[PDB]
Ligand binder design. Structure first.
Ligand code: AMP
Ligand code: NA
Ligand code: NA
Length: 365
């Protein structure tokens, strides 16, 4: 079905078509029928899936225009970062020209956002900390919210916003539509689905997502590869990074090496107990650990957070392994980056990978 085939108001369709948007992405095609009818859903998606429009369109269609001075918002979208709040606010503004969208975030003054809220708003796109400040001030009123969106729930959890998110949702009416989007579903997300949502349908598009990350094949010697990795990590300065290697022993050697060189790194391998694995992934999610060095076996699962950089320390054996590793990159609206380290010997190994993947990697020449 094209967008014109969905039940959308004439102005909304015209806005889509003006931007050359005609055909829903998979998450949009699956979510729209439920979302347009005000039902709750969990959208398990990563990068470049079009999840923003999957909630912006229902907000646009469900909310009628209002010119009431000082009006309270009827939609709340919560995002983990200022960067994402700005991108989402921008998209919602273009999808719904009839709604006043207000972006709310910290790092700046309180004055301009306060004035905008007081003037009247239809939708608020906010980081949870600043939204909560305005709520307690009495500036942001959420009693008329009809749609609440949690965009990247697992990352809000990682930024320490869990209690803020729950407070904000509790300030909205219980008849609200709730839409939750997240790459992973940790315990806190499942608690939300249970206590803050109404039997949401889960739609998981992980297996049908476009490649959004930058890929670079980097020639690197076997000897002293650790220093090469460490310098790359300092230069790139990712908030979270995952480094893949072949064996358990390697994950230990590398994690310990990176720790010695100043990186908060930990090994993730198959011989850890569930306690050990839970603590590692928990520390990773929380930011206490920022580099995870893992084997392919240990990284299988839904409990692994998205990262900003994936490094292939050894080459993957197969295209399947390459994609499983590399798909972990990209969070918070950013496409992320993948680096394949390869030695003097492995040129054809890389070419075979490219052939199998059906995609050429950028050569650092
Ligand atoms: N139906 C669509 N057709 C083509 N591109 C889209 C569509 N929906 C969203 N996009 C774009 O896909 C990118 C990824 O969106 P998101 O996954 O929401 O960050 C953004 O640049 C969107 O503008
Ligand atoms: Na239509
Ligand atoms: Na992607």
């Amino acid at each position: 079905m094209e967008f014109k085939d969905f039940p959308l108001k004439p102005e909304i369709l015209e806005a889509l078509h003006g931007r050359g948007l005609t055909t829903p992405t998979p998450i949009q095609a699956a979510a729209l029928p439920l979302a347009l009818e005000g039902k709750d859903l969990i959208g398990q998606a990563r990068t470049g899936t079009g999840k923003t429009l999957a909630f912006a369109l229902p907000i646009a269609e469900r909310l009628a225009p209002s010119q009431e001075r000082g009006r309270k918002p009827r939609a709340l979208v919560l995002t983990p970062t200022r960067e994402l709040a700005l991108q989402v606010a921008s998209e919602l503004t273009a999808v719904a020209p009839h709604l006043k969208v207000v972006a709310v975030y910290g790092g700046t003054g309180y004055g301009k956002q306060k004035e905008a809220l007081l003037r009247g708003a239809d939708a608020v796109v906010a980081t949870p900390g600043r939204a909560l400040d305005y709520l307690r001030q009495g500036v942001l009123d959420l009693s008329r919210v009809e749609v609440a969106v949690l965009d990247e729930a697992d990352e809000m959890l990682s930024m320490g916003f869990e209690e803020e998110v729950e407070a904000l949702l509790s300030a909205t009416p219980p008849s609200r539509q709730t839409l939750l989007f997240s790459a992973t579903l940790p315990s806190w997300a499942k608690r939300l689905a249970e206590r803050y949502m109404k039997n949401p349908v889960l739609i998981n598009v992980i297996k049908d997502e476009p490649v959004t990350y930058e890929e670079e094949a980097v020639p690197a010697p076997v000897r002293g590869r650790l220093e090469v990795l460490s310098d790359l990590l300092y230069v790139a300065s990712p908030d979270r990074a995952m480094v893949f290697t072949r064996t358990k022993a390697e994950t230990e050697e590398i994690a310990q090496g990176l720790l010695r060189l100043g990186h908060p790194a930990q090994a993730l391998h198959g011989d850890l107990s569930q306690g050990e694995r839970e603590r590692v992934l928990g520390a990773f999610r929380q930011g206490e650990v920022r580099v995870l060095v893992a084997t392919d076996v240990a990284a299988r699962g839904l409990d692994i957070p998205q990262v900003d950089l994936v490094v292939h320390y050894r080459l993957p054996d197969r295209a399947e392994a390459y994609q499983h590793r590399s798909g972990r990159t990209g969070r918070a609206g950013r496409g992320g980056r993948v680096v394949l380290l390869y030695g003097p010997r492995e040129r054809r190994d890389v070419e075979a990978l490219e052939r199998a993947v059906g995609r050429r990697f950028k050569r650092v020449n």
